[PDB]
Design a protein around this ligand. Structure first.
Ligand SMILES: O=c1ccn([C@@H]2O[C@H](COP(=O)(O)OP(=O)(O)O)[C@@H](O)[C@H]2O)c(=O)[nH]1
Ligand SMILES: O=c1ccn([C@@H]2O[C@H](COP(=O)(O)OP(=O)(O)O)[C@@H](O)[C@H]2O)c(=O)[nH]1
Ligand SMILES: OC[C@H]1O[C@](CO)(O[C@H]2O[C@H](CO)[C@@H](O)[C@H](O)[C@H]2O)[C@@H](O)[C@@H]1O
Ligand SMILES: OC[C@H]1O[C@](CO)(O[C@H]2O[C@H](CO)[C@@H](O)[C@H](O)[C@H]2O)[C@@H](O)[C@@H]1O
Lengths: 344, 344
């Protein structure tokens, strides 16, 4: 019953393959409008939404050879958001710190959902707008504390769209999903699959800056027989790619804000053996829906402890803490708190 | 009428500059002069910048040189956030950052004067036409490639000629010169081929950065390991002055729509003609047959070097004083402010 604006990034599509935030903004927007609200999506033009689409570019900036300066369309989008700031009751910004200086100029309250790691550089712009409205996707992400965190909403997925696999494929294999960046540590997943004797079926995208790390540590160890690649899969693939696997290796070497590939694996009914970094303990129920490992050798030992877990429970676990009914209804109270706590 | 509150917004890649510094040098002479005429200037640059106006530092070093910064876009939104939060304290804002400040102008009441320093790429042509009805000041006539914009004026950049020692006849062992970054846009590869057909050695001096590091190690690197081509890249003011002053003719072979190119008027300041390719804003600075030459190919330059000792080298210095003096530039910009302050 409010005028909401969801400012999504332009790198991807509301998303056929890669894209985490755009998937979260989708399940949020596609359900907010269903509850008699009034949302105006701010994303790309190829987006298939059920709200008033307002875009500055039709295609996605990532999969496009004709684009070169993304910061142009980054500033074009915000130029249309805060120009229409009088037509909105609350602005839900997902673009990150690029909207902080614009918030101190308009009148409409703006909420910022954090989606990345705080680095030694971006922590300065957050300290200059510490009292702004923030929303963390995990308690582990809340690292600055000095900011003004409104609440903590766990990212969710449409569980019914993920087909559930009870028993894995008869010839077992491991799994890896996500970008091939050092932030996800696929090189550990390569060794873990080889220290146990179970093949690995990887899947993800390789953008640049990852060109150096990929073809120096990941490409040398591809075979197609024991190590497959499948560069960037869609939804029906990762649905069955993780379903037929015994466990989704998630050996991160980076402060993971959340990790939607963990909750996606478990919907298909697959426990995630990940490193207890970032929001890994906040998602993985130890001994029930995965194993919170603390070393590379801990994952190898946990692999033998994977088949004894209940894969039918892993899906019912996502239906509890990681449901869209929990996430959207938890944002519906965040917007009211921001609107009720304004002037003093 | 002659007591304004100017707001100089400068880039952060280099300080207001030790060696390489294009836009940072123009802002320097413009700031130091306007303060010397009585205006209340407010500079938004780095921290080590040396000015007399009340500067507002957002990071105490040049980001290009400081390696601790991995995201330049962080301090971008910080500087622009501090400018337009104090816009009420200014009479007019002079932006030098580019398209990043266009959506900000459509949010306050202080008029902003945008001085363009870059080419209209296939991407920024979308944002510049969006904020078409604003206040733009070009730096050359050839730089105007949209035409349909709202150009307030065209103020050619200027340098302090008195700070450039005049070398009459150069060094008796003759050599050439190349100034500017070693980018395929400014064409450093063309300068060596002319140095072979003319047979005179070429002494270079520039800057190499990412995205172009592959080009440096490919085309330019296998030709400098010798006395014929002495590199010593990135020279400060007292070093690059003797380089151009001791050069019989500066090689400026460009293959890109140059908006201006301060390296040209710096060569002629110390008394040295420039042989540039007929492209961009080269005919607007170089006078054919008087203080240099304009060529349509590479062999046309080889025939031009044979007609350089006949060129007047003293008239090169007096030509910069004609239309590239700091007193002229600042007077034009000071006259631009009265145009913007009268339209409101
Ligand atoms: O082949 C792939 C690789 C990635 N993804 C999607 O990319 C998102 C990445 O999830 P996550 O948040 O955990 O990784 P990050 O955001 O750090 O890139 C997931 O939702 C996946 O659905 C996908 O669909 N197919
Ligand atoms: O080794 C160098 C190379 C360049 N410059 C300075 O960088 C400026 C060149 O500006 P230009 O417009 O030609 O390059 P751009 O700004 O387009 O990058 C000149 O004033 C030079 O004084 C320098 O000092 N040393
Ligand atoms: O760590 C940088 C990382 O962030 C980007 C965003 O451009 O990737 C994101 O892609 C989508 C949203 O664009 C989300 O899944 C999530 O925010 C990130 O994975 C990219 O620079 C880099 O891969
Ligand atoms: O505004 C960013 C601008 O800087 C880049 C960074 O890669 O490089 C330019 O930096 C100097 C700044 O003085 C420019 O004079 C010069 O054109 C570039 O080397 C450029 O791509 C970005 O557009």
């Amino acid at each position: 019953h409010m005028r909401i604006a969801q400012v999504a990034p332009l790198w991807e599509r509301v998303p056929p393959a890669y894209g985490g935030v755009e998937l979260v903004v989708s399940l949020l927007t596609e359900e907010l409008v269903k509850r008699g609200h009034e949302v105006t999506l701010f994303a790309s033009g190829d987006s298939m939404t059920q709200a008033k689409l307002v875009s500055t570019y039709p295609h996605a900036i990532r999969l496009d050879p004709n684009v070169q300066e993304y910061a142009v369309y980054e500033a074009l989008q915000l130029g249309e958001v805060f120009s229409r700031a009088n037509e909105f009751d609350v602005i839900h910004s997902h673009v990150g710190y690029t909207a902080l200086p614009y918030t101190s100029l308009v009148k409409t309250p703006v909420v910022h959902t954090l989606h990345g790691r705080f680095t030694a550089d971006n922590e300065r712009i957050f300290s200059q707008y510490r009292n702004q409205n923030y929303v963390s996707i995990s308690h582990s992400q809340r690292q600055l504390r000095e900011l003004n965190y409104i609440a903590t909403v766990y990212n969710a997925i449409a569980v019914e769209t993920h087909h559930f696999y009870p028993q894995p494929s008869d010839p077992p294999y491991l799994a890896f999903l996500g970008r091939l960046s050092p932030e996800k540590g696929p090189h550990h997943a390569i060794e873990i699959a080889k220290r146990v004797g179970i093949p690995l079926r990887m899947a993800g995208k390789v953008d640049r800056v990852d060109r150096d790390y990929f073809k120096e540590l990941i490409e040398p160890h591809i075979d197609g027989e024991f190590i497959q690649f499948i560069g960037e899969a869609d939804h029906p693939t990762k649905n069955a790619l993780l379903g037929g696997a015994i466990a989704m290796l998630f050996p991160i070497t980076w402060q993971e804000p959340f990790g939607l590939v963990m909750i996606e694996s478990m919907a298909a009914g697959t426990p995630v053996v990940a490193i207890a970094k970032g929001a890994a303990p906040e998602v993985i129920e130890h001994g029930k829906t995965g194993f919170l490992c603390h070393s590379v050798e801990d994952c190898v030992a946990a692999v033998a402890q994977v088949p004894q877990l209940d894969r039918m429970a892993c899906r019912d676990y996502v239906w509890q803490r990681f449901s869209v009914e929990r996430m959207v209804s938890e944002y519906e109270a965040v917007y009211d708190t921001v609107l009720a706590n304004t002037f003093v």
